[PDB]
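Consortium newsletter contribution from the modelling node. Members have asked for a concrete example of what our holo predictions look like. Here is one, prepared for the sodium ion complex that several groups have been discussing at recent meetings.
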Amino acid sequence: NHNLHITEKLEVLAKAYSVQGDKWRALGYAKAINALKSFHKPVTSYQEACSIPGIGKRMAEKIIEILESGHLRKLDHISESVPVLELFSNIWGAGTKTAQMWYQQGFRSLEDIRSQASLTTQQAIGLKHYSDFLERMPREEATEIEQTVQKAAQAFNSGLLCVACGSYRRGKATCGDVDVLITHPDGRSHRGIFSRLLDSLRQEGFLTDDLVKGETKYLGVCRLPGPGRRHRRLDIIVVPYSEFACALLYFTGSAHFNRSMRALAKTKGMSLSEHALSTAPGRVLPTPTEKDVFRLLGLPYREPAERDW
DNA sequence: CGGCAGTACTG
DNA sequence: CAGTACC
DNA sequence: GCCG
Ligand SMILES: [Cl-]
Ligand SMILES: [Mg+2]
Ligand code: NA
Ligand code: NA
Ligand code: NA
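And here is the predicted structure:
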């Protein structure tokens, strides 16, 4: 990254727009930050700034300002509210609208939130685990969590396949949470297992809090036994076997890689979701493998580690 | 001008 | 429904 | 914010 002196200050702007709710501008800043953290060179011209995909006139100009004096005028005019809004929206279950409302109501610290805010069930759990959920775990811990879920699943039906996705599958040394995808090659036995699986995992003390318990996805909180353990975010998603390849791809990510794939799909008159690759309500195309998705998009296969965009 | 993804939960 | 979350 |  020959441009960490540009990206460091752009990231302040990106975050300010993100937590203030301007999600599209925040998207544009993040793309430009990704582009600039990947070029071949330092950028030292406005005509070179425009050179790169994701950098336009206004973003060029901002490069051409750090160009000169080593800072961006715009940074000194970010609302004093941004760090508080960032604090509040780092509570799981609170996003930008809730953070702006708390701010408007005069809350300024997590002590204010604890003592005076009305919290949803999810947000009270997010607040209780505030620090823990900002921490990444070693991937060796994601492994133990995956194999905990697998053992409980395969106990009830040994045909069940369980796979940790997310940053774990992309090979990262640390993970923000664990995403366990479950399916069954028989095409039917995947259904209705959550009752049994989740109560099994509660039986250990392993599952400590539920955030979401739907018919096909569970989002919650777990903790391995013993000393020195922290609470970890855990998602479990159950999918029909015919959808396994698209689910693997979607839940392996990264989010920027998926977004680049949806856009490439759109150039070919197709659509790509966690459930399927389809034509324009079109037809679902058969994708038994991740490799088939790439092939039908006319792309060469990328292993999970080269999707970490 | 307007897309930049679609859906599953929660309440 | 609006809001939040998943990659 | 960028881009078509
Ligand atoms: Cl596959
Ligand atoms: Mg994850
Ligand atoms: Na949040
Ligand atoms: Na008060
Ligand atoms: Na997750």
